Design a protein around this nucleic acid. Structure first.
Lengths: 150, 120, 137, 51, 50, 228, 102
RNA sequence: CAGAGUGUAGCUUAACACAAAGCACCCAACUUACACUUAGGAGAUUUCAACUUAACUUGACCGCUCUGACCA
């Protein structure tokens, strides 16, 4: 009860709820993992995702890119027509992390590159300028946001 | 004829029982307890005691959990406790180690359902 | 009208500044274990234990039994550790333990139980029946 | 170490069998990848256009 | 420049029982950047003309 | 001013070029993963080709059989020669060329003469006014003798620091000691010229790093240099 | 979706199951050591970097303010993984054409 | 080089004895991945003696940390 000393003992809403990159911490980092092997990209992305949790780094989203199929043509023996040789498939995994300081970036980047498996390409870029931070939300999220708007 | 603490419908676990079999499985040890409604513990069986530890390859596997129930079932009969309730979570109920612990209690003569209170 | 609390609030220690980088529960079992810990602690407000819990005297109950035996922990611990390594060295026990087919002899377990911690369980069981409450007040 | 997350298997319920093959690059370097056919080596040719 | 009217009206979060001009002020009662200011010794409403 | 000289050290590292060979325990697991993979996968287009050909031959329009094409792949592979994981510099133990020890990281060491005594240390330059501490490490590359290398610096903060004092000979109130700051960078591409190699610089790993460095200097270096 | 591509499921003998089961227990301990070394390596770098910054501030607080700043030229960063064999100094790959399917 | 300080695997003011506990951690399965859960794995009292219970008290032995010597 409000007049009682135990007022507000049941409050929980402030416990649960209640990008811009500064000069000291990077805003959002997108880690691209290009490799001809599908399992190597999945495993390394899992390793990076588990590494961020151990190092107290928030992972925004871990998703995959559409597969790009590449046909490899080799010249025929003593001829001029290109004949089919092999089909190489490119697999990419993207692990999006945000909230990395510049000082801790030196250690974080060296650890991941040291454990980079063979045939796997590492590409880290920032795409917060591209924005497009729009995803489907649940009904309660819309209700709270619409409540603020009114 | 003794009244059970009915209620607590919106919370878990329930309190409508006389005795409860509560199993505590930690990182290294597995412990099963039989406690009364008022909170007092009747009998205990854990892997921390040397009696059960000296016969177990591992104190955190299914075998250790099954061995606790076989030891506890003998202690339940000696203590005179024959009926008790088991209130597991949906994942604990589906677990294999809890299934064999229930089997050990049933094969030991302990029924995991208390008889209904007599009102009239 | 408002009245200041007579004691620390339950969730007062939590800092709301860096709420995003705070470890959560993420599971029902982790919250339940912590929830039971605070439910067994004294509180300045009215609680279930205050009205339904069995009232006990704050004075510690006396012990009138035989003095506890004197056992050297260092020698006791070393002998127990040695037996574990021998049991785990055997490949048959590990195979049986991995196949969930191994079992312990119940008769031998109670023989050691009655000598080491049997009396303590009996005292706890006797207190549940209230034998000490009636026989020795 | 490069072996920290290198040893893995296909975590798919349904998939075709794959064989360990070598992918020789345009500079002679090779890499272990899994290919549909048991070709003991794969060499990527140099493109005529990129000359 | 002060706009005559807000671009989009918004419902206030204050309770409907409003004493907006009655009682001492509880905000903007101290200097922030400058050293001189006009102190209000009474309640009232300021419109676009003011 | 200050009685401690500010020297901007540089820690150039050569990333591994080849994958480190698997341990015997890893080899056993690698065979298990592939063995499990075959048992839990469907027939491929190549395997289904072979089974159908076996049935047709047993009963009795494909020119090339499944097994016959496999032999062609093997013949081409045996003709090509793979690169040597162990280079000639590994046999010659020439610690000046980047071609050696492709599996492990390499750390640059340069010998300098102080107090008429040669000491192997990391490249460094004195800090100057109107220049960041990181920029001091980048300047060290320009001071190297005929070097064509592009270094990738990670961040701006130093990766380590070491403190030493003059041994009561040149110790003065204006100059009491020095405090170096180590900056790590990645050697993208390039190598030194052929003018001076032996007495100029050497490339060694962390394990073989203690031979050249002093015990006290090595103590602060093995902290930010990983062996993964 | 066709069931004609399914392969026969050959049963695993007792020893085959026994070897795999014992092999997985040793692999769990081997991976624990790799994490232990990596955990200490990150801690070692973090402790040295934090200690180095403290010494920098005492000597010159201005240089401390620049070290903690971000590096715009740091990103993007591209690093290719190792290869099974080093590149051949003198190798001429055959001619061909590359076509990409999307 | 001495000087002090200090001692349970990562953490802990866990350890009365009945007992070296709890959590953190690691692998596999589930997940695109994380997480949950299921199923597994690795663990420790610096070492000695002191009337004995001494992880607990004393010193030694020992390691560690810190400050000077030492120092390019």
């Amino acid at each position: 009860y409000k007049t009682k000393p135990t007022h507000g003992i049941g409050k929980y809403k402030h416990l649960i709820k209640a990008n811009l990159g500064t000069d000291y911490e990077y805003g959002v980092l997108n880690i691209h993992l290009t490799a001809y092997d599908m399992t190597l990209a999945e495993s390394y992305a899992q390793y990076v995702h588990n590494l961020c949790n151990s190092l107290s780094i928030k992972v925004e989203e871990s998703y995959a890119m559409p597969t790009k199929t590449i046909e490899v043509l080799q010249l025929q023996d003593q001829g001029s027509k290109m004949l089919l040789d092999s089909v190489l498939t490119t697999h990419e995994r993207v692990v999006q992390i945000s909230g990395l300081s510049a000082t801790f970036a030196e250690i974080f980047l060296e650890i991941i590159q040291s454990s980079l498996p063979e045939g796997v390409r590492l590409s880290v870029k920032e795409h917060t300028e591209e924005d497009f931070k729009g995803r489907f939300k649940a009904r309660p999220e819309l209700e709270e946001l619409l409540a603020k708007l009114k | 004829v003794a009244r059970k603490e009915r209620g607590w419908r919106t919370v878990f676990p329930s309190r409508e029982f006389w005795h409860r079999l509560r199993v505590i499985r930690t990182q290294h040890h597995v412990e099963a307890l039989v406690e009364h409604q008022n909170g007092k513990v009747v009998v205990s069986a854990s892997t921390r005691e040397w009696a059960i530890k000296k016969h177990l390859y591992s104190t955190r596997n299914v075998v250790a959990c099954e061995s606790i129930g076989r030891v506890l079932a003998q202690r339940c009969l000696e203590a005179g406790i024959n009926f008790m309730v088991y209130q597991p979570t949906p994942w604990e109920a589906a677990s294999d180690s809890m299934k064999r612990l229930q089997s050990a209690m049933t094969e030991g003569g302990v029924v995991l359902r208390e008889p209904q209170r007599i009102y009239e | 009208r408002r009245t200041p609390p007579l004691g620390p609030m339950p969730n007062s220690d939590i800092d709301l500044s860096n709420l995003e980088r705070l470890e959560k529960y993420r599971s029902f079992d982790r919250y339940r274990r912590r929830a039971e810990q605070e439910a067994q602690a004294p509180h300045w407000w009215r609680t279930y234990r205050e009205y339904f819990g069995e009232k006990t005297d704050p004075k510690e109950k006396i012990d009138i039994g035989l003095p506890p035996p004197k056992v050297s922990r260092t020698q006791q611990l070393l002998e127990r550790k040695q037996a574990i390594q021998e049991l785990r060295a055997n490949v048959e026990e590990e195979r049986a333990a991995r196949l969930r087919t191994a079992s312990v002899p119940l008769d031998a377990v109670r023989a050691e139980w009655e000598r080491t911690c049997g009396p303590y369980h009996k005292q706890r069981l006797a207190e549940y029946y209230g034998l000490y409450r009636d026989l020795f007040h | 170490d490069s072996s920290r997350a290198s040893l893995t298997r296909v975590h798919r319920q349904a998939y075709a069998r794959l064989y360990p093959v070598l992918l020789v690059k345009q500079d002679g370097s090779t890499i272990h990848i899994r290919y549909r056919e048991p070709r003991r080596m794969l060499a990527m040719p140099i493109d005529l256009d990129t000359l | 420049f002060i706009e005559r009217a807000p671009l989009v009206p918004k419902v206030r979060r204050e309770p409907k029982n409003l004493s907006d001009i009655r009682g001492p002020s509880t905000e903007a009662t101290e200097f922030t950047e400058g050293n001189f200011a006009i102190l209000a010794l009474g309640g009232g409403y300021l419109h676009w003309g003011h | 001013g200050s009685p401690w000289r500010l020297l901007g050290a540089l820690c150039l590292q050569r990333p591994p070029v080849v994958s480190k060979p698997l341990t015997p325990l890893q080899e056993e697991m690698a065979s298990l993963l592939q063995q499990i993979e075959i048992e839990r996968s469907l027939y491929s287009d190549h395997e289904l080709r072979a089974l159908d050909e076996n049935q047709r031959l047993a009963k009795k329009q494909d020119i090339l059989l499944a097994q016959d094409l496999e032999d062609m792949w093997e013949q081409k592979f045996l003709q090509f020669k793979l690169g040597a994981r162990i280079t000639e510099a590994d046999e010659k133990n020439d610690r000046t060329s980047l071609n050696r020890k492709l599996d492990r990281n390499l750390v640059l060491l340069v010998r300098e003469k102080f107090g008429d005594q040669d000491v192997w240390i990391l490249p460094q330059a004195e800090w100057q006014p109107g220049e960041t501490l990181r920029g001091t490490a980048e300047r060290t590359l320009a001071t190297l003798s005929e070097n064509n290398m592009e270094a990738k610096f990670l961040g701006n903060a130093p990766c380590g620091h070491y403190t030493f004092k003059f041994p009561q000979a040149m110790r003065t109130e204006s100059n009491l000691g020095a405090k170096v700051f180590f900056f790590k960078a990645l050697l993208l591409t390039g190598d030194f010229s052929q003018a001076g190699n032996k007495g100029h610089h050497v490339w060694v790993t962390k394990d073989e790093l203690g031979d050249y460095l002093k015990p006290k200097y090595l103590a602060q270096v093995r902290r930010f240099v990983s062996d993964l | 979706l066709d069931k004609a591509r399914e392969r026969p499921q050959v049963e695993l003998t007792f020893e085959e199951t026994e070897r795999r089961a014992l092999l997985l227990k040793k692999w769990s301990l081997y991976k624990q050591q790799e994490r232990k070394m990596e955990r200490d390596t990150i801690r070692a770098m973090l402790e040295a970097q934090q200690e180095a910054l403290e010494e920098l501030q005492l000597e010159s607080p201005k240089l401390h303010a620049e070290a903690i700043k971000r590096d715009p030229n740091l990103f993007p960063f591209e690093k290719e993984g190792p290869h099974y064999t080093p590149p051949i100094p003198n190798y001429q790959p055959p001619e061909g054409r590359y076509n990409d399917i999307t």
